[PDB]
PDB file of C-alpha atoms and ligand atoms in Angstrom:
ATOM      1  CA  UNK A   1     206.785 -99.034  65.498  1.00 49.42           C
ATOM      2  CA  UNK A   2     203.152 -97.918  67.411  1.00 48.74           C
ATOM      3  CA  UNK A   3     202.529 -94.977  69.029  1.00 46.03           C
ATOM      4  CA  UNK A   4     203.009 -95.058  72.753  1.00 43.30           C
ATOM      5  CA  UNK A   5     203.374 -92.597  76.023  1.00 41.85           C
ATOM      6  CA  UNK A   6     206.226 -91.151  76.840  1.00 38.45           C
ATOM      7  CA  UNK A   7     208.559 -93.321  79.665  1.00 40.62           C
ATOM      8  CA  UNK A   8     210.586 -92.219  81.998  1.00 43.68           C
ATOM      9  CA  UNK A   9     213.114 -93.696  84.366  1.00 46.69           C
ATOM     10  CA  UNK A  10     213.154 -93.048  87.891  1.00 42.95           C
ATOM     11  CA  UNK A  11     216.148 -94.428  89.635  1.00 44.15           C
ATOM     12  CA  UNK A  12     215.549 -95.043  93.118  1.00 47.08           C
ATOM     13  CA  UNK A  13     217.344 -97.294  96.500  1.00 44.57           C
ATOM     14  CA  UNK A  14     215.232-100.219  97.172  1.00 42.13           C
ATOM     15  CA  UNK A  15     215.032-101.799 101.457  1.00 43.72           C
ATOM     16  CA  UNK A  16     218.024-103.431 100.660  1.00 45.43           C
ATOM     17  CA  UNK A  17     219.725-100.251  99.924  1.00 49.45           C
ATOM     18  CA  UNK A  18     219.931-101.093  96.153  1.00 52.28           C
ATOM     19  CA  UNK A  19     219.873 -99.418  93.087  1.00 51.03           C
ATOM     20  CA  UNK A  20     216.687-100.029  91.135  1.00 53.08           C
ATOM     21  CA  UNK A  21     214.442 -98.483  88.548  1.00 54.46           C
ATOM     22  CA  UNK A  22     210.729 -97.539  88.221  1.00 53.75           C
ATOM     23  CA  UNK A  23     209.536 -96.887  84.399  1.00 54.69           C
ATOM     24  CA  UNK A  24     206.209 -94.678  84.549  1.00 53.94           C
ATOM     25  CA  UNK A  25     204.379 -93.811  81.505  1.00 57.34           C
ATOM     26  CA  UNK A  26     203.106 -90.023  80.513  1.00 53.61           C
ATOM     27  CA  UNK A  27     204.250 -86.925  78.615  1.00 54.32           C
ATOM     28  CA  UNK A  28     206.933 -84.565  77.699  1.00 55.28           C
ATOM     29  CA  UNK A  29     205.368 -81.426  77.597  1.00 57.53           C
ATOM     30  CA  UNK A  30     205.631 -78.393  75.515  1.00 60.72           C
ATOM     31  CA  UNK A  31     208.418 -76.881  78.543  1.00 61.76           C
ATOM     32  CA  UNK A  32     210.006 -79.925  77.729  1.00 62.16           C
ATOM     33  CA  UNK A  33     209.613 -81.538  81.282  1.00 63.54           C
ATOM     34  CA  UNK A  34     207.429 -85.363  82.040  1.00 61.37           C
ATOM     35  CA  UNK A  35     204.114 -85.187  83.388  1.00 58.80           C
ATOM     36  CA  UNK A  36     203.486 -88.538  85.140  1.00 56.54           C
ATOM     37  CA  UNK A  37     200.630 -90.319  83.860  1.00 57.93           C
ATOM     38  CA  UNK A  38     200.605 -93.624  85.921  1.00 57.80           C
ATOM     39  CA  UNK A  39     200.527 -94.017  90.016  1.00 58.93           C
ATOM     40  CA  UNK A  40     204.092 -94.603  90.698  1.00 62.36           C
ATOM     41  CA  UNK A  41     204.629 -98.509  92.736  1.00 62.86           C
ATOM     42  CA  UNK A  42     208.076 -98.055  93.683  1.00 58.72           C
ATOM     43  CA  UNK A  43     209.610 -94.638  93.265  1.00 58.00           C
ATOM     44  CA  UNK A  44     209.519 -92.582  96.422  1.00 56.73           C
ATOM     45  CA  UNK A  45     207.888 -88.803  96.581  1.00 56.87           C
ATOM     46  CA  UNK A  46     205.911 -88.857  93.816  1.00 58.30           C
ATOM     47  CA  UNK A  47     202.758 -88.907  92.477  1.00 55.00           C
ATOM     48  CA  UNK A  48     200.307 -89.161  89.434  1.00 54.65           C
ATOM     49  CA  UNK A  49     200.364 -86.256  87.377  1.00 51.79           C
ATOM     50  CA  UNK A  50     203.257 -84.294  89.030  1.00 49.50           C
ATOM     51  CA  UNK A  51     205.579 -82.439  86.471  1.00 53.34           C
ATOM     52  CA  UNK A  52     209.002 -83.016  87.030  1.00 55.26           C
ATOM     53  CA  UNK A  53     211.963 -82.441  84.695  1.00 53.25           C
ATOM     54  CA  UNK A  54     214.363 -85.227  82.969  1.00 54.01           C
ATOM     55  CA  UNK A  55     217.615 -85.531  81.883  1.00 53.27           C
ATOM     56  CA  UNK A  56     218.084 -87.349  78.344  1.00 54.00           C
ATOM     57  CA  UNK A  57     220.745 -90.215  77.984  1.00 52.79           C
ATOM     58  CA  UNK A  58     220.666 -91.393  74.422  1.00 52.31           C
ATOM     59  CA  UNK A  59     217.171 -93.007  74.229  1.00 52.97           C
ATOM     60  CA  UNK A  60     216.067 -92.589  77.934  1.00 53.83           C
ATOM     61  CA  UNK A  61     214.300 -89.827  79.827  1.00 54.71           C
ATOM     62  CA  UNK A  62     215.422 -89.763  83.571  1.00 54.08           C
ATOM     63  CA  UNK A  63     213.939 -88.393  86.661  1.00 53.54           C
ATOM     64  CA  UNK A  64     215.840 -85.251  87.506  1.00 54.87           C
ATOM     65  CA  UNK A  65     214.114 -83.321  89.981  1.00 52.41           C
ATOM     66  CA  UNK A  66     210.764 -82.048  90.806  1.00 51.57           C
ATOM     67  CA  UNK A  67     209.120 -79.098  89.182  1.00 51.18           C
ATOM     68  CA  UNK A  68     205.648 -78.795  90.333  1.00 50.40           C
ATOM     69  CA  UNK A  69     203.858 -81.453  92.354  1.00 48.99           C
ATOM     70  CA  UNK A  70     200.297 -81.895  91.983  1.00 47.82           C
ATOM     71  CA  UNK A  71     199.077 -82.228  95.176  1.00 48.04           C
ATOM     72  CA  UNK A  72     198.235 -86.251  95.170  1.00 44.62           C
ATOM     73  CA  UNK A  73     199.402 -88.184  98.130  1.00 43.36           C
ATOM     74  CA  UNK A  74     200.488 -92.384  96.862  1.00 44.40           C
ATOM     75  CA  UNK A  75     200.057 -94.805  99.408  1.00 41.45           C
ATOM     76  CA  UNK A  76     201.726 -98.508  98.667  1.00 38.24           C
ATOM     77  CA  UNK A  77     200.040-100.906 100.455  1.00 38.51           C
ATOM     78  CA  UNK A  78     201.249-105.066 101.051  1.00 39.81           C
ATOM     79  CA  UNK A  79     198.499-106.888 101.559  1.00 40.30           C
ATOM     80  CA  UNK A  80     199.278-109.680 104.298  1.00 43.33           C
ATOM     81  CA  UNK A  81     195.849-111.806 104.849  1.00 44.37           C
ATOM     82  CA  UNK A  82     192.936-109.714 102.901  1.00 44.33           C
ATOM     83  CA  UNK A  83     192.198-106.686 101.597  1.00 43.27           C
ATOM     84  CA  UNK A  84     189.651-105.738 104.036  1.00 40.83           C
ATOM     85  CA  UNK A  85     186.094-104.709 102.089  1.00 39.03           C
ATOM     86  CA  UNK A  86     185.721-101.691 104.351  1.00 41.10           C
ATOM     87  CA  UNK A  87     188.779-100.000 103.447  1.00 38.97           C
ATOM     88  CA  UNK A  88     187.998-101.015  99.633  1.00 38.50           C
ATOM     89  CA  UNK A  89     184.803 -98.614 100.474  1.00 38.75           C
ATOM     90  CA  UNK A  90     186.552 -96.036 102.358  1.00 34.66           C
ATOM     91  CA  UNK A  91     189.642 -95.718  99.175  1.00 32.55           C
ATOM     92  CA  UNK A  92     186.171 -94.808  96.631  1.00 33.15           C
ATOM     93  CA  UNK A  93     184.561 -92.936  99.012  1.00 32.50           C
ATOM     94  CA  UNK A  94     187.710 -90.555  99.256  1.00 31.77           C
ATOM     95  CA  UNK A  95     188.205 -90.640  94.989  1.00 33.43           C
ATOM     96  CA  UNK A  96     191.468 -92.770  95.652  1.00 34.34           C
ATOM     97  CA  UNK A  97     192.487 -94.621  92.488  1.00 36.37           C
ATOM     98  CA  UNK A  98     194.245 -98.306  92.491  1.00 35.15           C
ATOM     99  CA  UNK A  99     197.099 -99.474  90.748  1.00 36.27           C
ATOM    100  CA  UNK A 100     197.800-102.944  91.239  1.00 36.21           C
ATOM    101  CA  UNK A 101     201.397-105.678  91.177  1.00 40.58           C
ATOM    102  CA  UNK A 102     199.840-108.619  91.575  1.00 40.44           C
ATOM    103  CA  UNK A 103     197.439-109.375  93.970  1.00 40.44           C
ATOM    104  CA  UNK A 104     198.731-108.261  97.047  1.00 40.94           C
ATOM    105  CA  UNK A 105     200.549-105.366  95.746  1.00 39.94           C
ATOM    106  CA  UNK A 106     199.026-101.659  95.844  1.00 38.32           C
ATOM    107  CA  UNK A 107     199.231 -98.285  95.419  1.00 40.06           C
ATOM    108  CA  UNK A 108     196.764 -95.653  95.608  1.00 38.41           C
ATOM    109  CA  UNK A 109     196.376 -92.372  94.786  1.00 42.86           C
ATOM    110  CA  UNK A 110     194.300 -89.652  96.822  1.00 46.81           C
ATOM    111  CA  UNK A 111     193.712 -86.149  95.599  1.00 48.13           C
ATOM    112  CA  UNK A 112     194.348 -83.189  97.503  1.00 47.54           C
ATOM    113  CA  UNK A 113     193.432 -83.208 101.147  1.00 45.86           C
ATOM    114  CA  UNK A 114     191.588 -86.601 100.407  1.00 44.26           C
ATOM    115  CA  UNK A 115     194.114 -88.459 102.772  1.00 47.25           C
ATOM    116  CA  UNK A 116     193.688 -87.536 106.053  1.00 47.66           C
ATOM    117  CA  UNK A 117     193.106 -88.756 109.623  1.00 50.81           C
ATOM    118  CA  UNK A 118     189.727 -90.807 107.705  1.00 54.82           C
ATOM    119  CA  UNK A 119     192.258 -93.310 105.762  1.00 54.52           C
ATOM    120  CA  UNK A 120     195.167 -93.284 108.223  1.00 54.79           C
ATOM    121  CA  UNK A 121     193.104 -94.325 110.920  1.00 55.26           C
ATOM    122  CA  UNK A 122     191.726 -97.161 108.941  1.00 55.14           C
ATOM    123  CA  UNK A 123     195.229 -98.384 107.499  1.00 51.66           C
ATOM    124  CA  UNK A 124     196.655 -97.946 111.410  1.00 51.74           C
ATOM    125  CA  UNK A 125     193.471-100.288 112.522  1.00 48.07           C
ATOM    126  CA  UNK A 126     194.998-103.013 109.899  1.00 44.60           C
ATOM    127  CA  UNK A 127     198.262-102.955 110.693  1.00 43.41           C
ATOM    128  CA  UNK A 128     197.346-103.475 113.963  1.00 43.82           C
ATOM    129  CA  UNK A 129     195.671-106.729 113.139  1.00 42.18           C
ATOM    130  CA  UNK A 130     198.792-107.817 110.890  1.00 40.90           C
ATOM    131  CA  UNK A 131     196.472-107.608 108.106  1.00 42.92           C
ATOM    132  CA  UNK A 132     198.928-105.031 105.615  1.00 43.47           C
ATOM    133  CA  UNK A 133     201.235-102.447 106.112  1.00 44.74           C
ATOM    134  CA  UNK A 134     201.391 -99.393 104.610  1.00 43.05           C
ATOM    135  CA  UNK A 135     204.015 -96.755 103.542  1.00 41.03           C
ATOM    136  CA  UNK A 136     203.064 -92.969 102.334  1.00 41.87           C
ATOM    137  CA  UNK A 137     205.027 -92.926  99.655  1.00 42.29           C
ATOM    138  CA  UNK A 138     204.250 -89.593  98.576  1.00 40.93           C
ATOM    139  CA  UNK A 139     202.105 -87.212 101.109  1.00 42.64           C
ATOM    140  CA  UNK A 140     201.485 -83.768  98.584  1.00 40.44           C
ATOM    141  CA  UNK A 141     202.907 -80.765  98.650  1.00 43.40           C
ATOM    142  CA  UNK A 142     206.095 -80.145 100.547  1.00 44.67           C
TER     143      UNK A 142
ATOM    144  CA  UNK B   1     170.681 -76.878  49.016  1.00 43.06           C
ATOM    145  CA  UNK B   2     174.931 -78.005  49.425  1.00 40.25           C
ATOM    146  CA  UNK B   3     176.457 -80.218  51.691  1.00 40.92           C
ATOM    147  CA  UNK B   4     177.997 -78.445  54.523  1.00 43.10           C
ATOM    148  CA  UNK B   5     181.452 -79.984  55.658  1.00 44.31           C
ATOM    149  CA  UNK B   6     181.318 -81.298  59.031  1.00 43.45           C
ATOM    150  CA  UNK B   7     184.349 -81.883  61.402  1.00 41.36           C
ATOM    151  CA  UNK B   8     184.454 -85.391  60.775  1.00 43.65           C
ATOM    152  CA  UNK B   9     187.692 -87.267  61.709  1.00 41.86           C
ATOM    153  CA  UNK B  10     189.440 -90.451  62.316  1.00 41.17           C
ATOM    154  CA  UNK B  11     191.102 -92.135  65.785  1.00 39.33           C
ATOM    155  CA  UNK B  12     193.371 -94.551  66.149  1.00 42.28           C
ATOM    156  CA  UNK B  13     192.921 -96.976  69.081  1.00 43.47           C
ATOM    157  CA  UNK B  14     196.410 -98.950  69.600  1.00 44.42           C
ATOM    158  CA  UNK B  15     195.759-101.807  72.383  1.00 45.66           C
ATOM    159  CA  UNK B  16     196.735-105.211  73.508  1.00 45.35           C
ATOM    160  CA  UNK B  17     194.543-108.132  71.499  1.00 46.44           C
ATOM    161  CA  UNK B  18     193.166-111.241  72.890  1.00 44.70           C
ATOM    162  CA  UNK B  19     197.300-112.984  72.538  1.00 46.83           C
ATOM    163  CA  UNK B  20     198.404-109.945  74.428  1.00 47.70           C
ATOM    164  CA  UNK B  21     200.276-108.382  70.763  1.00 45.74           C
ATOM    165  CA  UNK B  22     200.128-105.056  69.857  1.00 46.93           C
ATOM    166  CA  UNK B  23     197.082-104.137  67.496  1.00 50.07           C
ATOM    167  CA  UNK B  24     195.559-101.013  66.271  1.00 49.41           C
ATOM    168  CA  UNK B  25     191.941-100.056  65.476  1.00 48.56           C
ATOM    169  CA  UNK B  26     190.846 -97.093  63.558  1.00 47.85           C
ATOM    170  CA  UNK B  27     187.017 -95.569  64.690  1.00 47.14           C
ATOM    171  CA  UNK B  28     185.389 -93.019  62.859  1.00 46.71           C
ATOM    172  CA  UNK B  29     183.816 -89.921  64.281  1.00 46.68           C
ATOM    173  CA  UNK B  30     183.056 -86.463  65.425  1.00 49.87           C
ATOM    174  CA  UNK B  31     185.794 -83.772  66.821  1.00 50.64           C
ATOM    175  CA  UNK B  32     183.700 -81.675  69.586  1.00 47.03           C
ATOM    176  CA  UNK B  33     184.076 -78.133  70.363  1.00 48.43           C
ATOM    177  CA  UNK B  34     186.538 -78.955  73.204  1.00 45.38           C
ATOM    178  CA  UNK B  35     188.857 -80.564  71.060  1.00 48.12           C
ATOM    179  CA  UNK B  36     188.044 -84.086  72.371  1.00 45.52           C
ATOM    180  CA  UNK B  37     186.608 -86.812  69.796  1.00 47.30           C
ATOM    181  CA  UNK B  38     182.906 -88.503  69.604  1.00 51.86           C
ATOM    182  CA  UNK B  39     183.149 -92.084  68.779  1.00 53.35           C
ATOM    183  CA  UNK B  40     180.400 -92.973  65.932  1.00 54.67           C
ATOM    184  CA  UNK B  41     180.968 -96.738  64.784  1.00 57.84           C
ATOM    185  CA  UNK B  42     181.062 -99.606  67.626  1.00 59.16           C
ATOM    186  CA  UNK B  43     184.356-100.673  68.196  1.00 58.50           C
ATOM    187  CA  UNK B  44     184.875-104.149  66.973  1.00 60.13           C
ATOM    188  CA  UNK B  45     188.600-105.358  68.953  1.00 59.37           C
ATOM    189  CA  UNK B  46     189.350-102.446  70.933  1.00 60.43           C
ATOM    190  CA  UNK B  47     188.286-102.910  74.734  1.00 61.52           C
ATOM    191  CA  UNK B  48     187.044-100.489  77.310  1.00 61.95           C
ATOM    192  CA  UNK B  49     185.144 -98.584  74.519  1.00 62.28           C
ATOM    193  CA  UNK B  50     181.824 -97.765  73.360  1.00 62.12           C
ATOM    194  CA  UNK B  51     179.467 -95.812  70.705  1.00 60.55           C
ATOM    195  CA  UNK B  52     179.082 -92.381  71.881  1.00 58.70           C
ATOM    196  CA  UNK B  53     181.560 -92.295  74.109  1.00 58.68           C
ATOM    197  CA  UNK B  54     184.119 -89.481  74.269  1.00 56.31           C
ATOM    198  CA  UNK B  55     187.552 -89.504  74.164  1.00 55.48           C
ATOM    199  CA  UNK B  56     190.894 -87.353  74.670  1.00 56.22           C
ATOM    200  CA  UNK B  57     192.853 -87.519  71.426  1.00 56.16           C
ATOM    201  CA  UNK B  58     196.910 -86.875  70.491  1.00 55.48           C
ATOM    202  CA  UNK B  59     198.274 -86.068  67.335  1.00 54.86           C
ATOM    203  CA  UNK B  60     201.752 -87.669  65.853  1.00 53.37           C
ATOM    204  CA  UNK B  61     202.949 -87.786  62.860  1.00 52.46           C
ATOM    205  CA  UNK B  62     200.160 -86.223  61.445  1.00 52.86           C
ATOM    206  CA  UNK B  63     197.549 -89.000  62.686  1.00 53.72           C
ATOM    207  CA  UNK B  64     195.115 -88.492  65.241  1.00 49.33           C
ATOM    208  CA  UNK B  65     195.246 -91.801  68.499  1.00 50.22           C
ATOM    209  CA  UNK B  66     193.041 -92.091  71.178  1.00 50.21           C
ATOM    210  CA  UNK B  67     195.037 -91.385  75.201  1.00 47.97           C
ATOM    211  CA  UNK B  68     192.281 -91.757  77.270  1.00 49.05           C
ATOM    212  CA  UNK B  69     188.447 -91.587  77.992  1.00 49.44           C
ATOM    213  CA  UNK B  70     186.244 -88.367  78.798  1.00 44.23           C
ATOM    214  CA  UNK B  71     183.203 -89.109  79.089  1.00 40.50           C
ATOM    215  CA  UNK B  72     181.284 -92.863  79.112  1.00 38.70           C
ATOM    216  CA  UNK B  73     178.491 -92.784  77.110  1.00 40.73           C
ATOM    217  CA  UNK B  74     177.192 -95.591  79.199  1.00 40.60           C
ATOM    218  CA  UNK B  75     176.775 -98.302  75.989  1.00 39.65           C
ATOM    219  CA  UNK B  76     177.849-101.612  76.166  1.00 39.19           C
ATOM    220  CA  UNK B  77     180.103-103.200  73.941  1.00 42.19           C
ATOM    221  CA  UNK B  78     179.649-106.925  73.365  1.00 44.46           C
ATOM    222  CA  UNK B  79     182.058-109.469  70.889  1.00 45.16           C
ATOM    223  CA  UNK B  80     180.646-112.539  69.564  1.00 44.71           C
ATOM    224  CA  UNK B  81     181.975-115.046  67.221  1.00 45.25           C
ATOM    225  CA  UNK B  82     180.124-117.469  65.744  1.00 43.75           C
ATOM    226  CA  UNK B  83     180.926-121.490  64.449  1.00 42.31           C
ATOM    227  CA  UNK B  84     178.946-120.682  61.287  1.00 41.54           C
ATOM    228  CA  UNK B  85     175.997-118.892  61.669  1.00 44.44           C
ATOM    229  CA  UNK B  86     174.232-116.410  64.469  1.00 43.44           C
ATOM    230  CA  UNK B  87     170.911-118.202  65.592  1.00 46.53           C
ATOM    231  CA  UNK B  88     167.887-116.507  64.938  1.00 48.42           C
ATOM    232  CA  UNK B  89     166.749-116.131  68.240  1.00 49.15           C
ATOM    233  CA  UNK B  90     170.071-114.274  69.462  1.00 46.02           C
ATOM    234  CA  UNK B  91     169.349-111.744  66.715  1.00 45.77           C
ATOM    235  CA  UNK B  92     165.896-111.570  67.539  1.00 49.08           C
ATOM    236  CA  UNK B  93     167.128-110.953  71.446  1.00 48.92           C
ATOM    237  CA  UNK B  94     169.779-108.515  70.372  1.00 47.90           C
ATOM    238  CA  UNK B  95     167.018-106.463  68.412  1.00 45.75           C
ATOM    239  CA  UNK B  96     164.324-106.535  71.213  1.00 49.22           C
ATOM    240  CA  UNK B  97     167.315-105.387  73.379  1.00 48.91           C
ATOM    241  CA  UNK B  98     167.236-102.510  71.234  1.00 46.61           C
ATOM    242  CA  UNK B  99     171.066-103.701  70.402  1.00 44.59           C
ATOM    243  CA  UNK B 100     172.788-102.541  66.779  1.00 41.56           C
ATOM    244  CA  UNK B 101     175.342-104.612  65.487  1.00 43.57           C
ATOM    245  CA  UNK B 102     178.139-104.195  63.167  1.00 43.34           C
ATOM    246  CA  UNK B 103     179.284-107.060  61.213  1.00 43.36           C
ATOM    247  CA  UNK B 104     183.297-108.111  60.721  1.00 44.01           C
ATOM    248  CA  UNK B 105     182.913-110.897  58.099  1.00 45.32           C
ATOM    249  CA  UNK B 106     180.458-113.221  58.341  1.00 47.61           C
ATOM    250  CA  UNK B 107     180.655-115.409  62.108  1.00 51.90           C
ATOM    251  CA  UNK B 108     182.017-112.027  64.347  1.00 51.05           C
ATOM    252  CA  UNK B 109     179.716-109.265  65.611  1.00 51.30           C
ATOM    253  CA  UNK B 110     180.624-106.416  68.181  1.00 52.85           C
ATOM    254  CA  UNK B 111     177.341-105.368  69.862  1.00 52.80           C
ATOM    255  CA  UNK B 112     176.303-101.743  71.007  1.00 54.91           C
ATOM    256  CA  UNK B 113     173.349-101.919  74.160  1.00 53.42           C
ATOM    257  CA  UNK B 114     172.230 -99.287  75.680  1.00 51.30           C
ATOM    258  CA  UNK B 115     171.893 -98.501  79.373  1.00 52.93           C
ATOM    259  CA  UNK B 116     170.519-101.649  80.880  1.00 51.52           C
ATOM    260  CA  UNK B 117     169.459-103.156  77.786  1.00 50.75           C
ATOM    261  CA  UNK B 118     172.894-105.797  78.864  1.00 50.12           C
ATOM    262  CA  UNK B 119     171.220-108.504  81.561  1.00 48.33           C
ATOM    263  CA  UNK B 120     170.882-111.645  82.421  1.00 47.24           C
ATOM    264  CA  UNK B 121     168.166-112.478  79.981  1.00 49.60           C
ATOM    265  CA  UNK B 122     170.087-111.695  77.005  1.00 50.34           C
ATOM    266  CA  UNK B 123     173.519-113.298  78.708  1.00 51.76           C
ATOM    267  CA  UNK B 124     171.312-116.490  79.503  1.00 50.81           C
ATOM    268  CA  UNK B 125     171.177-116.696  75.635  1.00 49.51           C
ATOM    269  CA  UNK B 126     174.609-116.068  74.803  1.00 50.04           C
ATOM    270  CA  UNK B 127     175.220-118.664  77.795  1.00 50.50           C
ATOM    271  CA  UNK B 128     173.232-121.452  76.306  1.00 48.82           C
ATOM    272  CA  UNK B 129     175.310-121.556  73.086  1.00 47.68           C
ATOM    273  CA  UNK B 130     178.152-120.896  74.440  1.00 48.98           C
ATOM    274  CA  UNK B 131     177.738-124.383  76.295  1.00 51.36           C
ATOM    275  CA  UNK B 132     177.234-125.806  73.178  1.00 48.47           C
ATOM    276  CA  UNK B 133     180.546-124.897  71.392  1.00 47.40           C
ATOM    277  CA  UNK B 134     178.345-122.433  68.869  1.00 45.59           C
ATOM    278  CA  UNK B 135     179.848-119.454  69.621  1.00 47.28           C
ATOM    279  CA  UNK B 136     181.880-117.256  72.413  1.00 52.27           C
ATOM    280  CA  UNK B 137     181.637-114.351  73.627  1.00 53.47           C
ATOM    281  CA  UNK B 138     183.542-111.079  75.359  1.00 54.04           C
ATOM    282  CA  UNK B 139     182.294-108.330  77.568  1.00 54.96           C
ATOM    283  CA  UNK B 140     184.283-105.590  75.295  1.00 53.08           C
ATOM    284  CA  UNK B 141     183.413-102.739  77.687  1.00 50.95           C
ATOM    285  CA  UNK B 142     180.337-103.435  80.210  1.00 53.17           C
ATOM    286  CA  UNK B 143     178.154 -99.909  80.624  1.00 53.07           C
ATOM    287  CA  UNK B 144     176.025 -98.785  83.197  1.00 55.42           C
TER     288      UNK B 144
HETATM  289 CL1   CL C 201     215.843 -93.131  96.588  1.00 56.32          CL
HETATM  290 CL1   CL C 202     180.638 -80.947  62.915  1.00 55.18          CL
HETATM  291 CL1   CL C 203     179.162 -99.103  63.897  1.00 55.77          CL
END
């Protein structure tokens, strides 16, 4: 027994049309609802640090529904020759934070209004080339 | 003249060691005005973490563990671990460095240096014995 964060379960249909699960770390607040404390990988329409409330099943906290979003856009990102250095530059420039699976594996989290026509353009340019693809996993506020 | 009682306080660190287990570290220091907690001692395991630097604290079970950084103070935290002794001329290097050390037993230091005090001279030391199976070495948390 250590002290840890909060997790809770996000079920969620894969590309194959699948069931599968995304476990993100954070906090049940005083309302009794999860604030998201990691950058979600999988999980569709959502984002770091949006509040959202659970269900309880014995020992597990699921996703329910949304209560308040916070704004941040998650890009994933599959990485198919390199990650190009420019983009690396133009995801700090725009106070995007990386989570990484692996190597070739990303998601990234923008703050309000910090993806915009500047990153999509760039991501468009590499797809282009065959060099990633890209899904917006989670673009704000509704 | 009294002593005046301070807001001194405790933190538990809980990370993942060097064999990837679960370990826990407990640094002393300083509750701020905000509610967020000044780290005073160097840590000696615990990465990412420095002197001075503050922290965001949560409280279970009536105990007081660290959830994530404020505010870098900029220090650098350095691990070394010695055969059987530290060579004189790494101290001496550490000390012109104007590095303070804190001891765990007698062949492991964790090393506080300040901003830019952590280059490549002192690393060309630590390199040098390192080669020769004297001691290792870990960037703990590398500062500005
Ligand atoms: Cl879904
Ligand atoms: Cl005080
Ligand atoms: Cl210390």
């Amino acid at each position: 027994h250590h002290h840890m964060k909060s997790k809770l379960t996000v079920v969620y249909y894969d590309l194959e049309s699948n069931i599968a699960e995304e476990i993100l770390s954070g906090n049940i607040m005083p309302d009794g609802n999860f604030l998201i404390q990691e950058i979600p990988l999988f999980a569709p329409n959502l984002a770091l640090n949006d509040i959202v409330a659970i269900e309880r099943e014995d020992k597990m906290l699921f996703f329910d529904h949304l209560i308040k979003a916070s704004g941040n856009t998650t890009i994933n990102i599959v990485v198919l020759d390199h990650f190009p250095k420019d983009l690396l530059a133009a995801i700090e420039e725009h106070s995007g934070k990386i989570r990484k699976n692996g190597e070739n594996y990303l998601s990234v989290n923008f703050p309000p209004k910090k993806y915009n026509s500047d990153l999509k353009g760039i991501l468009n340019r590499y797809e282009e080339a065959n060099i990633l693809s890209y899904r917006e996993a989670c673009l704000g506020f509704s």
